[PDB]
Design a protein around this ligand. Sequence first.
Ligand SMILES: Cn1nc(-c2cnc(N)c(-c3cnn(C(N)=O)c3)n2)nc1C1(c2ccccc2)CC1
Length: 820
Amino acid sequence: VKKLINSQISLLIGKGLHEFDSLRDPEVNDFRTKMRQFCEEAAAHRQQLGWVEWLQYSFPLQLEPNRALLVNVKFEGSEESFTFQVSTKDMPLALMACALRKKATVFRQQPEEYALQVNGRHEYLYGNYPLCHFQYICSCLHSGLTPHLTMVHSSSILAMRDEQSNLWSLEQPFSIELIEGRKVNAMKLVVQAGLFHGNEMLCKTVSSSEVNVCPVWKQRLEFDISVCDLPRMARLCFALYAVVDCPIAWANLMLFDYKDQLKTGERCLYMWPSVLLNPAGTVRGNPNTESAAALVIYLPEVAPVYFPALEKILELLREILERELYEHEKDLVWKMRHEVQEHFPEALARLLLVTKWNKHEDVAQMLYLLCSWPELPVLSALELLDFSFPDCYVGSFAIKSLRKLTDDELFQYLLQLVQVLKYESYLDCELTKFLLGRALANRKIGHFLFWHLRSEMHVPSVALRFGLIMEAYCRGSTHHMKVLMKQGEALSKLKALNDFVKVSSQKTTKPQTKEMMHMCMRQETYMEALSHLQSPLDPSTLLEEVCVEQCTFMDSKMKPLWIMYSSEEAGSAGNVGIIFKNGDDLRQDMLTLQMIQLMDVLWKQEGLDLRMTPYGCLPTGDRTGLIEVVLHSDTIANIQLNKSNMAATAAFNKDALLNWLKSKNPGEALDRAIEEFTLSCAGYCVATYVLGIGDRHSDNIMIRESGQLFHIDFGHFLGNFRVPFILTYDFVHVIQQGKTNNSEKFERFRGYCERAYTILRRHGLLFLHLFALMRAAGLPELSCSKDIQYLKDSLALGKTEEEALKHFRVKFNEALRESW
Ligand SMILES: Cn1nc(-c2cnc(N)c(-c3cnn(C(N)=O)c3)n2)nc1C1(c2ccccc2)CC1
């Protein structure tokens, strides 16, 4: 039992638990015991939660950021149902009462004892909220479907819960002895060092002696800083390069250990290959000890030297610049530090960037203001998670301020918070305890936290950390671990199936490959593995019976698979699909879609539903991911091919899109699809201009039969190949309802673009903090300031609301003139 769980975690996280112990590292050993225990206490509090609190954990509510409707209600142990004509202003409790009365009259004889489960879904409807505030109700009111819900009693939810149980006295200057190395190159070799407190130097970059390629130095490198004035998060960074410039390898390390003690004596640093100095990189050596260039160095003794505790630390024209600053302006902010705490608390980030981290008296002065610093908003707190604020007490404060994050806000920023783990100096950190804690209190946070870490297990710089966090998570969730093993089981099968489709497509016809994909899919093991799991894209979505005849593959380079599902219990809402792609990095796609989804949230909060399609996209492994099938859609390209004996047969290529809409929306149903198209077009015109989505062509823009426009293939963003605003004649034609001149519908569409644009600019900083935290990912198109800059200009964040609107009008007008 205890052994099987250990072998289950190993297979699931894709790294044997025997490997962690084989390193014999006390830090890895300390994190494992402490986090195992932390996660087991969370598991314990959970198994005692009330039945409603278990619904908030296992099935958290999907809420939207009057008018009549038909709803179908049945009960758990019967096929018998009742269809009611209720209102969007009614709470679930009233519908639950109607359902219990209709039961009493059929069965010839309390609502607070039930929850409404969404049929064939891991979704529920409970709490004091009108029906239209629920995502499932809106997805029914929009598509034209009748919600199907089952009355689940308190005892059946409790049965689920139960079945799912488990110092200053050192004034000398800092120095190291650079002994030798064991690398490969073909010239002389120089080892440049540097002391860093995040993205900033504590002193200048002291270089080494030019020793020949054949390498021994044995030099005492002296740094321009004192041993008493080393910050706790001091980072000694190295770089090895060849000269007659060519980078070879880099390596970083902390001067204090996880137990706050200054390190001694000999250190062999297994270096990471280079693409000058890299302070942002991992402080753990390359795990490929056999094929890695190593650097031996000495950490001289100073006699145990522990970093002082907080009790010792604690004992030891201004308004015009508060909206990069000069050396005199910095001195002003630092002298005024007490006034900044009391009258400008949100300016904290600017005060943290002016304190001299190269002087221990200055740090304690800053930290004294910080320990009495009032709580900052979520927006201020997301800025302090950057590697630009590396201090542990700053990070602890940032986490403290982020504790007020709702489960909806935390879920929206989970990708950025997972990325910040790459910046952490030590294994046991506040961020992990916060993620793991918040994961174990919410199965949906826990699901996605797992997939974010699992997706990168093949990346050796994070493999140890990500694997230890997943192991700690499984300790606190034995049932979920098995639920996620089922998802990896389907994915292991989709990878072997896709490898066959790849080989087969280069040897035979598509109908021949398709038929054999079906014969392989219909094998016992494939039928079991691909059916009856939760969707890695959405835990609330249940992938029940796999529809083998409806499955195929797409013709693009990597032969993506088209896997269809159906569920008897769910009805039409159970007809779902996933696209399995293997070969491309899907990280940037996920980020771009999450940023569009965030835009849709900020628009919906202000009462604007621009009819957006934020379809799921999730990396699951090495160059492997899933995309969500948006049902009843097709590319602009396909529609425009204009084939004969079809309902979309056009006399002119321009009419193809409008004829396609007419054929799918007959009669009075057409006018709504023109509005759907107009709103979605405006939202994607803003999203693509703001995010710099270039290289747009008819085969990467899609339309739903409902009229809704949306983009696919986000392989390029932030201007990478200054992208101008885009307007296609083929779309303006549809907005104008097939008229040459129609300004009434064009200006209302221009209004949508203007309104959408302004709303985004007000949260411009939120996109700025989130994209800055994202630099930790290693996306080749999100690597520097020139990438974050594109967003600063696209949103004209410097300018006022009226100045930016005119600048946008020039961008919107230049797109219209470019439209043939
Ligand atoms: C009908 N239909 N629906 C889609 C569809 C639906 N939802 C999506 N999210 C995406 C998507 C997103 N990214 N992406 C990608 N990178 O490839 C694809 N595509 N595609 C088709 C087509 C198809 C399907 C199967 C076999 C041949 C041709 C006609 C192309």
